[PDB]
Amino acid sequence: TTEEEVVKNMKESLEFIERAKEEGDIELVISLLNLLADVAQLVGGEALEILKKATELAKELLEESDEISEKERVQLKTALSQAEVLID
Amino acid sequence: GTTEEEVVKNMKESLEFIERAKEEGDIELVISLLNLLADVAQLVGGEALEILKKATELAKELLEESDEISEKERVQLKTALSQAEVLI
Amino acid sequence: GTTEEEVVKNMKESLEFIERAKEEGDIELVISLLNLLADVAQLVGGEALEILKKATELAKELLEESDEISEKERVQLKTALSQAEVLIDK
Ligand SMILES: [Ca+2]
Ligand SMILES: [Ca+2]
């Protein structure tokens, strides 16, 4: 792989998170936020900027959604913790 | 700072959800939370690893407590357990 | 605690389940196991990285060959592949 191929995949993941927030697809936000954080922890650099954008959207979903279950809340906040520690 | 404290606070809530999950048979949730707690604990250390040790003990029991756990679920849980056990 | 042989054992069984999930079209399992393998391989190196390499080749094959993979499954699988491929090069 190249870094450019990785950031393209991370960008497409970010776009799906943007739409998943409107859709209420909480599970995919949890899964993609965890996957993006696993990638950015190995890549650093621009991968962390994309993770920062994904983290912002997940935070908003966590605050604005009235559909999120208690199980999804605890998973999403744990994934947020991984991201927040990386983007700090 | 406020980051690490919120992190370990979030991890403690997840610990409680893993316990309920282990009793409802929500093995998927146990797998997901154990992997998320390990991803966080790897970056934080300290009290995060104490919390991970406890979640590992909870997940280890569920392994062979009620044969509701499928073969696919078992291999995923064992792989997640391995991640956590190495960090411990 | 755990031993490297116990971890390598679990990693080999995961790879067996991945290859089976590839031919059964179980996309979700491949995504979950590929990510779990990369998480473990990051901490152990050695033969863990060789098992990850095999799992990565199988997941690439699944991405190119399968037909009932959803759009959302695809973007998860590509990102998990990115994680694995970066670790293999680290
Ligand atoms: Ca919806
Ligand atoms: Ca992970």
Residues within 8 A of C (CB atoms), A 15-74 only: 16, 25, 28, 31-32, 34-36, 38-39, 42-43
> Cα separation of B7 and A87, whole Å?
14
Contacts of B48 (CB under 8 A, 6+ apart): B7, B8, B11, B37, B40, B41
Alpha carbon distance A75, A85 (integer Å):
16
Q: Give the C-alpha separation, B2 to B20, whole Å.
A: 28
* Elucidation method: X-ray
Mark residue A65 as left, alpha or beta (left: phi above 0; alpha: psi -120 to 50; beta: remaining): beta
C-beta atoms of A35 and C85 within 8 A: no
Give the whole-angstrom CA distance, residue A86 versus residue A67. Answer: 28
The residues near A29 (Cβ < 8 Å, ≥ 6 apart) are: A17, A20, A21, A57, A58, A61, A76
Q: Which amino acid is at A33?
A: L
Instruction: Please name which of C85, C63, C58 lies closest in space to residue C74, comparing C-alpha atoms.
Output: C63
Q: Both tokens of residue B15?
A: 């610990």
Please name the residue of chain A whose CA is at the shortest distance from the CA of residue C37. A38
- Rounded alpha-carbon distances, angstroms, from residue B78 to A5, A9, A65, B9, B60: 31, 28, 33, 26, 9
Rg, C-alpha atoms of chain A: 12
Inter-chain Cβ pairs, chain A and chain B, closer than 8 A: 52
How does C69-78 read in b/e, with b if 16+ C-beta sit within 10 Å? beebbbbbbb
Handedness of CA C68, B79, A53, A28 (dihedral sign): positive
Nearest-ligand number for the alpha carbon of B79: 2
Structure token pair of residue B55: 């979640």
Q: What is the resolution of this structure in A?
A: 2.0
Q: In the complex, which subunits touch B with 3 or more CB pairs below 8 angstroms?
A: A, C
Taking a 5 Å cut-off on Cβ, the residues next to ion ligand 2 are A 38; B 39; C 39
Point out the ligand nearest to the CA of residue A21: 1
- Residue A1 has a CB neighbour count (10 Å cut-off) of 15
User: Cα torsion at A6, A7, A10, A16 (round to 10°)?
Assistant: -130
Residue A20 to residue A8: CA distance in whole angstroms? 18
Under a CB-based contact definition with an 8 Å cutoff, are residues B55 and B63 in contact?
no
CA distance C39 to C61: 21
Whose structure tokens read 């960090």?
A: B87
- How far apart are the CA of B71 and the nearest CA of chain A, in angstroms? 22
Count of residues making up chain B: 88
Q: Are C19 and B80 in contact (CB under 8 A)?
A: no
Instruction: Please return the burial class of C54, using the count of CB atoms within 10 Å of its CB with bins 0-12, 13-18 and 19+.
Output: middle
Distance of CA C73 to the CA centre of its chain: 14
